[PDB]
């Protein structure tokens, strides 16, 4: 009866930057939260470890999760390639929101984004399922390698990840 806490250790060109901890709202979106949790432990044989943040736009968000093609076209869920939009109870209310990227209605795989600002235009379209619990300062340092068009100037990698609780 406790929401999982997951962590990512971020590296910039192999150099360790720090740890970001996330609280996953398994009490509101159990199946989206579980997908993210299991991809962070790597327990199904595949996951986030070693993958990158392929698209970062300062003031907007940091996008990652494509562990198969590393460019925005791949990734899959623990349920098969894609799964449904569970619900839209939570909104993109400010910095630190963790939400799912997609290619339209009911197309969730493994790609996600961490909001750097309130992005109310994404409400009802992207499922919010967690928030940054510790290390928002590491996300702010990550944005500095992003650009208006999303290209990063440095390789931002998840060097390790797992579950803390």
């Amino acid at each position: 009866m406790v929401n999982p806490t997951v962590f990512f250790d971020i590296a910039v060109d192999g150099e360790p930057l720090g740890r970001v901890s996330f609280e996953l709202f398994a009490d509101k979106v159990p199946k989206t939260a579980e997908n993210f949790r299991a991809l962070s432990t790597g327990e199904k044989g595949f996951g986030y470890k070693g993958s990158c943040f392929h698209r970062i736009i300062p003031g907007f968000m940091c996008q990652g999760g494509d562990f198969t093609r590393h460019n925005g076209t791949g990734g899959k869920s623990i349920y098969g390639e894609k799964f449904e939009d569970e619900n839209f109870i939570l909104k993109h209310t400010g910095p630190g929101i963790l939400s799912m990227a997609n290619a339209g209605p009911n197309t969730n795989g493994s790609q996600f984004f961490i909001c750097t600002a309130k992005t109310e235009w994404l409400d009802g379209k992207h499922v919010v399922f967690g928030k940054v619990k510790e290390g928002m300062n590491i996300v702010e340092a990550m944005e500095r390698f992003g650009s208006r068009n999303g290209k990063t100037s440095k390789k931002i990698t998840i060097a390790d990840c797992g579950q803390l609780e």
Partner: peptide, 11 residues
């Protein structure tokens, strides 16, 4: 513009 998609990214 400022969207978050997987595959065809929009302006």
């Amino acid at each position: 513009x400022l969207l978050v998609x997987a595959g065809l990214v929009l302006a």
